[PDB]
Design a protein around this ligand. Structure first.
Ligand SMILES: [Ca+2]
Ligand SMILES: [Ca+2]
Ligand SMILES: [Ca+2]
Ligand SMILES: [Ca+2]
Lengths: 142, 148, 143
């Protein structure tokens, strides 16, 4: 079943809770929380990093993600791709171009969520294996 | 300080840095530090960008027949829709030209040999279309002069 | 409290001549013992952030603070499994050893070839070229 107007409203609600100043962006690390903070079906519940890394989420430097990119991606997760989706994109881009008059959030894409995430979780694995080797070496002396 | 863009290089998935030369030719080079590969990426619209070679103050653009060229003036043909493909590479298509029936975009691209392809021949899902920007600085820009 | 014994082992592996103080040289030989290849700058860094006295060397209290910052799990999640799932393209719980090696050498705080070689010998137990990361994370968090 499709998406009610209620759903969009709740989206913009928690969006405000993560974006008080209406910069229309959100930080890389806060994304996961945002995905967790939605009602179904938009909701991507934790753990969700591998799920989030699978959607097209361009980031502008420095590691910020735009609202509309998240809206498109998150609604596409649900629908997903179709002709009705294209029309819905027309509507979303229009409604956004309405409720937002300025050009302050218009900044060019520099990477994608997936790249940053690949770096971060690579690091996580590295530091982990390093602590492991150190532990093994301290244990080595008995 | 009206439009908040960036100054970058654009790395081709085909293995080249995108290069806009003084004679106005566009291709790919393996010269790491060619000064002819820095670009002004300027946000002229919602997820839309203009790509201008710094050393030549030239805009990349695409005409009605799909041929990629350079313009000293800022036409609406100098506007590119940016979007990522498979959350890993950035693609740039024309804002005004498409299949018209199928709606598929005409994209900025390079073949395997680093030469510039016709817009309509570059498919968004082929490596030819794929770029990864490698930025140098953020930068503010004066919103440019629209023409015909 | 009762752990102190291993600490007397631990310092003893860093302190080669047992003078009660760790120098950039001894630190160096140990980091190299792990498979790293630190610069002199990197070592003077590993020292200066945990240096209370500013005497350029590291005694027992400083060795404690440093070994504490090091042994501390920053990603307190044993869900660094998630981190591995990020690189498992098809979600079958196996990553090709080649892929893993490439990723670990070319991303983030990149590993040396020595570290990486060891990690793969430990990770690819049957040597079939595929790596079961679940079991590897278990081995790693056994402590
Ligand atoms: Ca000593
Ligand atoms: Ca000291
Ligand atoms: Ca796999
Ligand atoms: Ca195996």
């Amino acid at each position: 079943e499709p998406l009610s107007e209620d759903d969009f409203e709740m989206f913009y609600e928690v969006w405000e809770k993560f974006d008080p100043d209406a910069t229309q962006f959100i930080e890389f690390a806060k994304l996961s929380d945002f995905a967790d903070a939605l009602d179904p079906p938009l909701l991507i519940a934790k753990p969700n990093k591998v799920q989030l890394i699978a959607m097209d989420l361009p980031m502008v430097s420095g590691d910020r993600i735009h609202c509309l990119d998240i809206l498109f991606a998150f609604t596409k997760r649900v629908l997903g791709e179709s002709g009705e989706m294209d029309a819905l994109r027309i509507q979303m881009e229009e409604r956004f171009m309405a409720s937002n008059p300025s050009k302050v959030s218009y900044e060019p894409i520099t990477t994608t969520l997936k790249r940053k995430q690949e770096e971060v979780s690579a690091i996580i694995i590295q530091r982990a294996y390093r602590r492991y080797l150190l532990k093994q070496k301290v244990k080595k002396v008995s | 300080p009206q439009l908040k863009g960036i100054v970058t290089k654009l790395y081709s998935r085909q293995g080249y840095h995108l290069q806009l030369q003084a004679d106005g030719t566009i291709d790919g080079t393996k010269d790491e530090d060619s000064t002819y590969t820095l670009f002004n990426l300027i946000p002229v619209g919602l997820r839309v960008v203009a790509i201008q070679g710094v050393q030549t103050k030239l805009y990349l653009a695409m005409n009605s027949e799909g041929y990629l060229y350079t313009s000293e003036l800022f036409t609406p043909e100098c506007k590119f829709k940016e979007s990522v493909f498979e959350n890993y590479y950035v693609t740039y298509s024309s804002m005004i030209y498409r299949q018209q029936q199928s709606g598929r975009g005409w994209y900025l691209g390079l073949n395997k040999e680093g030469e510039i392809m016709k817009g309509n021949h570059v498919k968004k899902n082929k490596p030819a279309a794929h770029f990864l920007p490698k930025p140098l600085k953020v930068a503010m820009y004066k919103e440019p002069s629209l023409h015909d | 409290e009762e752990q102190i014994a291993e600490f007397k082992e631990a310092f003893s592996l860093f302190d080669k001549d047992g003078d009660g103080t760790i120098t950039t040289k001894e630190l160096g030989t140990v980091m190299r013992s792990l498979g790293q290849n630190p610069t002199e700058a990197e070592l003077q860094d590993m020292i200066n952030e945990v240096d209370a006295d500013g005497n350029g060397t590291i005694d027992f209290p400083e060795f404690l603070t440093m070994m504490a910052r090091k042994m501390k799990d920053t990603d307190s999640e044993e869900e660094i499994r998630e981190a591995f799932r990020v690189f498992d393209k098809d979600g079958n719980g196996y990553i090709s050893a080649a892929e893993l090696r490439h990723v670990m050498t070319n991303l983030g705080e990149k590993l040396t070839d020595e570290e990486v070689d060891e990690m793969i010998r430990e990770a690819d137990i049957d040597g079939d070229g595929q790596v079961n990361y679940e079991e590897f994370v278990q081995m790693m968090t056994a402590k």
